[PDB]
Amino acid sequence: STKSDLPAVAAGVEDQPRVPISAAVIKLGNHAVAVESLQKMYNDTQSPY
């Protein structure tokens, strides 16, 4: 059964504590989505984004 097995699927993923994260989010239709750019780290290292 799916409800009986959901603890087996998440092998300690729900156990770990959660922390707030900084990222821009938008509401498209019904989905909330996170949008971001990583170009800072690649500009810092002179590697091609």
């Binding site: 780290m41 690649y42 810092d44 290292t45 590697s47």
Partner: protein, 49 residues
């Protein structure tokens, strides 16, 4: 800082370089006048109003 690479190329070496700048010097010069009479009467002692 540098990024790790996984390709066949030799690993990118960490980079520390030395940057030397030069200090400029500026000079400023102002000219002022004082007439000889303006400087003479300072030595004299005034009593009458």
């Amino acid at each position: 800082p540098t990024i790790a690479h996984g390709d066949g190329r030799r690993p990118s070496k960490q980079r520390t370089f030395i940057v030397v700048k030069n200090c400029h010097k500026h000079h400023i010069s102002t000219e002022m006048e004082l007439s000889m009479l303006d400087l003479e009467i300072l030595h004299s002692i005034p009593e009458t109003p």
